[PDB]
RNA sequence: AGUUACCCUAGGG
RNA sequence: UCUCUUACUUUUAACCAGUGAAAUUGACCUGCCCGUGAGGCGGGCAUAACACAGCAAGACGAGACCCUAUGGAGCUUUAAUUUAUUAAUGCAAACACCUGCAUUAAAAA
RNA sequence: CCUCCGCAUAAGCCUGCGUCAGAUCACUGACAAUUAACAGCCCAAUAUCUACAAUCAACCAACAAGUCAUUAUUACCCUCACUGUCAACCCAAGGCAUGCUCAUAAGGAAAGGUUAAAAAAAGUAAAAGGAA
RNA sequence: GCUAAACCUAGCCCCAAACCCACUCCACCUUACUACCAAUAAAGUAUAGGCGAUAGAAAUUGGGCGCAAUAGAUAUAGUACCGCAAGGGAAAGAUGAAAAAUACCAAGCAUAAUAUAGCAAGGACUAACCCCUAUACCUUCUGAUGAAUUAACUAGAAAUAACUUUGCAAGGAGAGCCAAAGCUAAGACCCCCGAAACCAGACGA
């Protein structure tokens, strides 16, 4: 993907993205404040409080994070209205649409105080690093079966250790085990 | 922008960088020397100062060596400190005449000498001046081990020098077999220029030749990790045993 | 194997063996009418005819009677926004005639909306006799 | 395509298998021979004066009677060093531009925030 | 037009055959040309 | 020192 | 060919439809006679506005020739002086080749 | 109704009127294809042999004097790999090597519609005279 | 109201600092990208020179009053394109927090063709025209040249002396230099485009 490529709500490869960002656009880049990977503290599934714009003071859940633009999409909040399925003769159906919010316009919420608080990333003996609130010494945990198929290896077969560490190459082990015999000896050649 | 270092310092920087840095110190010193070859094609001034007849005051005078072009044939032979003078002249020694190109070539003589220390008849292209420094130095041997690199200005001269100095350093019995008294006589005759063998090994080497020697010297087959690990395991067992 | 140096052979030397083959293959539907015993493959450029025969015989236990190969030239007649030519890669086509009177035919592979559709039956299209007056009002 | 993810998964699995076998091969080679690479090679200096890693090929005859090999020049004549210097200066220019542009971008970032 | 003629006069081998051709290639490499030869 | 119908360039009539 | 041109056909052309350049262009509300020095000045005269097709009298549009430059280039020589050289000689050096110093020519500046 | 063109190979070019879909006197995206017997791609050494043209090659007929070949000893046992193969095409804005057909079995279309002015171009016919 | 206009930021420039680059596998000197065979000062002083145009020592001393898409790199790229080759060498983009929300201004025209007469105006006028007055401009001659039009770009660079204004004053000046009111500091003077040639090294014929 080209440099200064503009990240948006549609995923970087989608049809809407190829339409919005064809291979020949050169727009003004967006100034995103550099937040280190270990300084980020809003995750998908997090409950958050909205400070700015419409829906200020309402609490929601982080549905998507676009970390390339310090963006959090709070599901059902910061919402305008758009029509979908606009055909030639049908106006389509109106639906609520979310606009991204910068991380500065969103705070995290304690599970018992239910108030917006600042967060630091403190080390814990049990867990090497975890979030903590500032107003209180409370940790905020990170939020969010199967059937084996005809071509899925069982865990019992997958984890079995059949490897005996030896000083033979795969070629040699396979030749010995497959009973391939070779009496002809390699005649050394010149390398240069 | 600007370079950190002047461009003429880049050769000197390179000499301290890699395999050049790993060369013997004495050889790098020999490369570093810049001392001036003795005047051959120009007359040096008597003194540093001189009173000119024009204004009658004393000024300092310097001798600016005339550039000498040494054709590659000179490196095979043994000329003096002399070679070609690629210059210009005025048509009839008058500055109001045209300027026209001249080359001054030496007179080459295909003479034949005998190196006693190397005990060999060498046929060499020389100059009359070479014969003169031969006479003043009392022999090809003394001439070769006396005359410095810039005054010799010959690769063949330095090959002879390196051979001679190695033969001295090695105390080599192969000069005159079944003839020890003459060998000792010749070897004592040149006790003055006795040098360590390591120093004699790198004498007269062009820089590329020295790099080639060094890269041979430090070329070793990589020792297999098997014996390193075996020795480490043995050492650990020794440490555990003493516990 | 592709993208490897092959050990050089000299007279009376061991057989060259490949233990984990590196080139992969697809059998594609012919674009034209072909005999019944002919199977068409797309094949890497380095893979030879003997290699393909041995590959099928060994890995897939397919008895192969004949193999033919051609190199298909990909088009260079298409350009970027920068008027720079875009290359469709060249590839190798193999035609494998099966042995023992066998036959191959290419198999017939490939033989949120609720609310949108439920409102799609609730058009209640504009009545011509109303003449543009909104139908929402109960008056 | 019905499910294109499993193609990527198969490719990743085969890359993993290649990595595992290659690790074993190089561990054994380091143990027995001490060499770090399977193919012999050297640090040479081609006609254009640049240092390259020449990888060796397999031949039947030794190199001194190899007519084609001896046509190649693994040395640079003194007319190359000027071009080497000019390339060095071109690289220096590109680096200076890059580092300066990074610094300007940092200034802009600090201005906005 | 002839491919033999073209590769004979302006090709890589003909260029590297002489110091002048090596300098042509070096000039083109400094300029950043995509095609250094025929 | 001649010469240019091979002359050439900047201008002028 | 001409006295001496005529008829026909095709192309072109004119009109209808589609597509659609270029040189050119100070601005123009762009007349005639005479005079001065001519669509534009002076004196007379004329004079509603508006296409399309024509014509080619005027408006508007190369190829030469001479001179100049304290501007070039080439060619020929018995311009300047010189022989860097190349061919010869003569003399030095060395025990003929190679070198240094002078002279004579061709080809040269 | 034209055909002085055509069909192959070479050279050159490089997917450049195949299918599906779309936009634009009235190209883009996707998919598909040229399958070797033709043609490229050759040759184990060491010596040692290679005077008498072609032209129906027989006379004739000559000068410019010619386009062609093996032997001895030694070594030798594995075999059908690789590559070109498409088109309405190239070079310039008319030219093009070779073979085959010498009007075609192959290949094409001079008229966008009308009118029937001038001038212009080409063609045909022209009394009497026939270079004025 | 069409055509259009407008936009800031990609990047770049000059410094400082610091001495840079170069083997995933594979292929590449054969027709390349082809597995494999015979500081400052001394000082513009001494000096050199058709002693002239000019040339000229030494001893000695010690981040931004930057550009911001015709700019700034040629650079969106040494790409497209041109050339057999060496080689030459471009143009251009702009919404917003979200696209998982689609007005007003060049020339040229249109709305809206024209009416005796004439550098197209000026004086006027109740009144557009009618009346009166009015030889386009620039350059070069003493008094033919160029230009369709719009937008952008586009052309005076040197402080010796002197002068003015300060400082200090027989001294001035932060070494060196000058001084018979001088010395120190400042200010203020010297454009753009446009040959044939010659030389060096390549590339083709």
Swiss-Prot record, chain A:
Classification via Gene3D superfamilies: 2.30.30.30
Chief localisation class: mitochondrion
Coiled coil, from the record: none
A Pfam family reported for this protein in Swiss-Prot or TrEMBL: ribosomal_L24
The KOW domain, residue ranges: 42-75
UniProt keyword terms in alphabetical order: Mitochondrion, Phosphoprotein, Ribonucleoprotein, Ribosomal protein, Transit peptide
Quaternary structure and interacting proteins, as annotated: Component of the mitochondrial large ribosomal subunit (mt-LSU). Mature mammalian 55S mitochondrial ribosomes consist of a small (28S) and a large (39S) subunit. The 28S small subunit contains a 12S ribosomal RNA (12S mt-rRNA) and 30 different proteins. The 39S large subunit contains a 16S rRNA (16S mt-rRNA), a copy of mitochondrial valine transfer RNA (mt-tRNA(Val)), which plays an integral structural role, and 52 different proteins.
Name of the protein: Large ribosomal subunit protein uL24m
Gene source species: Homo sapiens (Human)
Gene name per UniProt: MRPL24
UniProtKB/Swiss-Prot annotation, chain B:
Chief localisation class: mitochondrion
A molecular-function term among this protein's GO annotations: RNA binding
Locations listed in the record: Mitochondrion
Origin species: Homo sapiens (Human)
Top-level taxon of the source organism: Eukaryota
Family: Belongs to the bacterial ribosomal protein bL28 family.
A GO CC term assigned to this protein in UniProt: mitochondrial ribosome
Tissue specificity of this protein: Found in a variety of normal tissues including spleen, testes, thymus, liver, kidney, brain, adrenal, lung and retinal tissue.
Gene3D superfamilies to which the protein is assigned, alphabetical: Ribosomal protein L28/L24
Protein name (database record): Large ribosomal subunit protein bL28m
Record Pfam families: Ribosomal_L28
Anything else known: Potentially represents an important therapeutic reagent for HLA-A24 patients. This antigen is recognized by tumor-infiltrating lymphocyte (TIL) 1290 in the context of HLA-A24.
Keyword annotations from UniProtKB, A to Z: Mitochondrion, Ribonucleoprotein, Ribosomal protein, Transit peptide
Quaternary structure, from the entry: Component of the mitochondrial large ribosomal subunit (mt-LSU). Mature mammalian 55S mitochondrial ribosomes consist of a small (28S) and a large (39S) subunit. The 28S small subunit contains a 12S ribosomal RNA (12S mt-rRNA) and 30 different proteins. The 39S large subunit contains a 16S rRNA (16S mt-rRNA), a copy of mitochondrial valine transfer RNA (mt-tRNA(Val)), which plays an integral structural role, and 52 different proteins. Interacts with OXA1L.
Transit peptide: 1-54
Keyword Ribosomal protein carried by entry: yes
Gene of this entry: MRPL28
A GO BP entry: mitochondrial translation
From Swiss-Prot, chain C:
Compartments, record wording: Mitochondrion
Keywords of the record: Mitochondrion, Ribonucleoprotein, Ribosomal protein
Gene: MRPL23
Family to which the UniProt record says this protein belongs: Belongs to the universal ribosomal protein uL23 family.
Entry's Gene Ontology molecular function annotations: RNA binding; structural constituent of ribosome
Assembly and binders: Component of the mitochondrial large ribosomal subunit (mt-LSU). Mature mammalian 55S mitochondrial ribosomes consist of a small (28S) and a large (39S) subunit. The 28S small subunit contains a 12S ribosomal RNA (12S mt-rRNA) and 30 different proteins. The 39S large subunit contains a 16S rRNA (16S mt-rRNA), a copy of mitochondrial valine transfer RNA (mt-tRNA(Val)), which plays an integral structural role, and 52 different proteins.
A biological process from GO: translation
A GO CC term attached to the entry: fibrillar center
Segments of this protein annotated with the region Disordered: 107-139
Pfam families per the UniProt record, alphabetical: Ribosomal_L23 (PF00276)
UniProt feature, compositional bias: Basic and acidic residues: 117-130
Stated name of the protein: Large ribosomal subunit protein uL23m
Entry annotated with the keyword Mitochondrion: yes
InterPro entries assigned to the protein according to its UniProt record, in alphabetical order: Nucleotide-bd_a/b_plait_sf, Ribosomal_uL23-like, Ribosomal_uL23/eL15/eS24_sf
Organism this protein belongs to: Homo sapiens (Human)
Main location: mitochondrion
SUPFAM superfamilies: Ribosomal proteins S24e, L23 and L15e
From Swiss-Prot, chain D:
GO cellular component: mitochondrial inner membrane; mitochondrial large ribosomal subunit; mitochondrion
One GO MF term: structural constituent of ribosome
Record keywords: Acetylation, Mitochondrion, Ribonucleoprotein, Ribosomal protein, Transit peptide
Residues where N6-acetyllysine is found: 19
SS bonds (residue pairs): none
Main location: mitochondrion
One of the GO biological process terms: mitochondrial translation
Subcellular location(s) per record: Mitochondrion
Family note: Belongs to the universal ribosomal protein uL29 family.
Quaternary state and interactors: Component of the mitochondrial large ribosomal subunit (mt-LSU). Mature mammalian 55S mitochondrial ribosomes consist of a small (28S) and a large (39S) subunit. The 28S small subunit contains a 12S ribosomal RNA (12S mt-rRNA) and 30 different proteins. The 39S large subunit contains a 16S rRNA (16S mt-rRNA), a copy of mitochondrial valine transfer RNA (mt-tRNA(Val)), which plays an integral structural role, and 52 different proteins.
Listed name of the protein: Large ribosomal subunit protein uL29m
Annotated source species: Homo sapiens
Gene (UniProt): MRPL47
Parent-record interval covered: 126 to 238 of 250
């Amino acid at each position: 993907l080209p440099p200064h490529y503009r990240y948006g709500m549609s995923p970087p490869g989608s049809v809407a993205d190829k339409r919005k960002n064809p291979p020949w656009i050169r727009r003004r880049p967006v100034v995103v404040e550099p937040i280190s990977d270990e300084d980020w503290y809003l995750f998908c599934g997090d409950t958050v409080e909205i400070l700015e714009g419409k829906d200020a003071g309402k609490q929601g859940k982080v549905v998507q994070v676009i970390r390339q633009r310090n963006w959090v999409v709070v599901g059902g909040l910061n919402t305008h209205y758009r029509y979908i399925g606009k055909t030639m003769d049908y106006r389509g159906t109106m639906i609520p649409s979310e606009a991204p919010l910068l991380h500065r316009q969103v705070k995290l919420v304690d599970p018992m105080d239910r108030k917006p608080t600042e967060i630091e990333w403190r080390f814990t003996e049990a867990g090497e690093r975890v979030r903590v609130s500032t107003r209180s010494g409370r940790i905020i945990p990170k939020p969010e079966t199967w059937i084996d198929g005809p071509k899925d290896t069982s865990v019992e077969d997958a984890l079995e250790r059949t490897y005996v560490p030896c000083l033979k190459t795969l070629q040699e082990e396979v030749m010995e085990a497959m009973g391939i015999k070779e009496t002809r000896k390699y005649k050394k050649v010149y390398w240069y | 922008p600007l370079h950190k270092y002047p461009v003429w310092l880049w050769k000197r920087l390179q000499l301290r960088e890699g395999i050049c840095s790993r060369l013997p110190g004495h050889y790098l010193r020999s490369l570093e020397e810049e001392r001036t070859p003795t005047p051959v094609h120009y007359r040096p001034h008597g003194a540093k100062f001189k009173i000119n007849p024009k204004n009658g005051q004393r000024e300092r005078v310097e001798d600016v060596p005339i550039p000498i072009y040494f054709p590659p044939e000179s490196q095979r032979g043994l000329w003096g400190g002399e070679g070609w003078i690629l210059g210009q002249i005025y048509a009839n020694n008058d500055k109001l005449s045209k300027r026209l190109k001249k080359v001054w070539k030496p007179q080459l003589f295909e003479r034949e000498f005998y190196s006693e220390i190397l005990d060999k008849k060498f046929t060499v292209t020389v100059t009359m001046r070479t014969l003169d420094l031969i006479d003043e130095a009392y022999g090809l041997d003394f001439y070769i081990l006396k005359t410095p690199k810039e005054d010799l200005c010959s690769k063949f001269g330095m090959d002879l020098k390196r051979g001679m100095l190695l033969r001295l350093a090695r105390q080599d019995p192969q000069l005159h077999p079944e003839d020890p008294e003459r060998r000792a006589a010749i070897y004592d005759k040149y006790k003055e220029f006795a040098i360590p063998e390591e120093e004699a090994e790198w004498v007269g080497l062009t820089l590329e030749e020295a790099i080639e020697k060094q890269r041979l010297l430090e070329e070793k087959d990589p020792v297999p990790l098997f014996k390193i690990y075996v020795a480490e395991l043995i050492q650990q067992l020794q440490q555990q045993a003493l516990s | 194997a592709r993208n490897v140096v092959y050990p050089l052979y000299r007279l009376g030397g061991p057989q060259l063996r490949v233990f984990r083959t590196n080139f992969f293959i697809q059998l594609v539907r012919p674009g034209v009418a072909q005999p019944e015993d002919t199977v068409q493959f797309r094949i890497p450029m380095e893979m030879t005819r003997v290699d393909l025969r041995n590959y099928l015989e060994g890995i897939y236990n397919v008895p192969v009677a004949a193999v033919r190969t051609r190199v298909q030239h990909g088009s260079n007649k298409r350009r970027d926004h920068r008027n720079v030519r875009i290359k469709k890669p060249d590839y190798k086509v193999a035609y494998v005639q099966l042995a023992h009177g066998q036959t191959f035919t290419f198999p017939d592979l490939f033989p949120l909306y609720s609310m949108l559709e439920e409102e799609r039956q609730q058009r209640q299209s504009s009545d011509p006799r109303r003449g543009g007056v909104p139908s929402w009002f109960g008056l | 395509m019905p499910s294109p993810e499993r193609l990527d998964k198969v490719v990743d699995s085969m890359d993993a298998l290649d990595k595992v076998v290659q690790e074993r091969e190089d561990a054994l080679r380091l143990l027995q021979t001490g060499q770090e690479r399977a193919r012999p090679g050297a640090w040479r200096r081609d006609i254009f004066g640049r240092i390259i890693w020449h990888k060796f090929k397999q031949w039947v005859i030794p190199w001194h009677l190899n007519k084609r090999y001896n046509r190649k020049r693994f040395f640079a004549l003194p007319y190359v060093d000027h071009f080497l210097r000019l390339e060095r200066e071109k690289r220096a220019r590109i680096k200076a531009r890059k580092e300066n542009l990074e610094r300007k971008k940092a200034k802009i970032l600090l201005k906005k925030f | 037009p002839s491919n033999i003629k073209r590769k004979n006069k302006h090709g890589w081998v003909r260029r590297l055959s002489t110091p002048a051709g090596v300098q042509v290639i070096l000039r083109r490499m400094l300029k950043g040309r995509k095609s250094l030869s025929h």
